[PDB]
Amino acid sequence: PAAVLLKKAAGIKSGSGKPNKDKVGKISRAQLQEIAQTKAADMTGADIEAMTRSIEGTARSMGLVV
Amino acid sequence: MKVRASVKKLCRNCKIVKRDGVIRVICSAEPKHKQRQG
Amino acid sequence: MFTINAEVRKEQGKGASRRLRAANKFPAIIYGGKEAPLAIELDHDKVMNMQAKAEFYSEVLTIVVDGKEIKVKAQDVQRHPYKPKLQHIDFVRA
Amino acid sequence: SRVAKAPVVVPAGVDVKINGQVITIKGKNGELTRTLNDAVEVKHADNTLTFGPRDGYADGWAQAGTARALLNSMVIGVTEGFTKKLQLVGVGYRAAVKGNVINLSLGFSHPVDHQLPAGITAECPTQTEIVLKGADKQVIGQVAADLRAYRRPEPYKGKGVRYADEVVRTKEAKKK
């Protein structure tokens, strides 16, 4: 769902700081898009992109800048 | 109980009452917060 | 939007102004244009409530005295030295 | 409510004699009497009573509320009575019901016997769980406090007389 498949961001669960800190993870254009698009089990609704954009934008705020 | 001049609320759970000639602060959970206006 | 009522000052001076302030109404002067200045007096609390908005100073207001509703501005305000009060608001015509 | 605005309803079988500021209630569960303050005028002209204070006082609404609450509690305790209970958490804490006298041997070299009011009954199925019943919840609470005053629940171990709904705490003494 959003835990065991969200720990798969760049190779590690999460190892980055928000503004500019000890970051170990990055993000591509579809790496975290697929983990929310390919899954029709955890979706509250049908808008997959609605929760995909949130993860893509919070990758930067966690340390996985685009 | 802590007796002092100026009394207040340490945590929100503390209630202030006014008895015969004094003002007291009583906390239901933590006895340490018990205070009096001496 | 701002509409205030006024009265004409029967007596003017330090003693009259301080008596008015004790009576909870403060004086004011209206001048400008080519007409003689007029000494009015206003309720203090109404003006204090109205002056809170920035629009009171940045927009035209109207003052009504003896049935005449004249539109004026607010250029200078003298605040109380150490209290949330204003004394002798200044109104400029036109 | 705001001030004794919510009326009390008195069930049938509870005889009430109201005389000015003095009221008497007689039911199956004992008899009670109360003479009130000067902020009263409660009236009884229907199936129940609804309170009122006397005119000409800066106070009076709060007193009417207090009188209404007290009379409601007394009506409830005279029509059905109230009951409380105490639990003795600890080895050697023996409680015995000798009729109208309780015996409380709680780690004392000198055993202590306590008297009871004439309107209070008590019974203990064991030596640690005591249950008492009465008509007046004020007297019930007073006697319960008298019983519990012999020993308080110590936070460091958790022994001593306490109410059934009392919540004791055990934070830490020294880790040993």
């Binding site: 979706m43 509250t44 609704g45 049908a46 | - | - | -």
Partner: protein, 130 residues
């Protein structure tokens, strides 16, 4: 909520029934997010892409709000009766969705009934898609 949203609540209550408000009741325990997502998913996939299981319990909404159908809509107003309203149709499978959800640990208040559109008794009729 605020009066500006209370206005919209009544506007929706008197626009919901016009296009068909198939309604039901959801438990407070079944409305928990840990176990509400299943019902949300089921109802949404069955009906459309939008869902509304939000409860809007009111007494005056049973005299001037929800009731716009034939005669009976004021029996789901008081006594903790949750509101679950669905737009698409007055005879769709939304009743059957809650009937199925009943079998999976849902026995809360009123046997998932509301708006009495197809003269629905405690037992569902054959009108619903099977």
């Amino acid at each position: 909520a605020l009066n500006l949203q209370d206005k919209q609540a009544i506007v929706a209550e008197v626009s919901e029934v016009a296009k068909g408000a198939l309604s039901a009741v959801v438990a407070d325990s079944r409305g928990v997010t840990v176990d509400k997502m299943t019902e949300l998913r089921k109802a949404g996939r069955e009906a459309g892409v939008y869902m509304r299981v939000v409860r809007n319990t009111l007494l005056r909404r049973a005299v001037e709000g929800t009731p716009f159908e034939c005669l009976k809509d004021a029996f789901v107003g008081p006594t903790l009766i949750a509101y679950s309203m669905e737009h698409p149709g007055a005879a769709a499978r939304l009743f059957k969705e809650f009937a199925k959800a009943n079998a999976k640990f849902e026995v809360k208040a009123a046997a998932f009934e509301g708006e009495l559109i197809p003269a629905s008794q405690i037992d569902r009729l054959a009108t619903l898609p099977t």
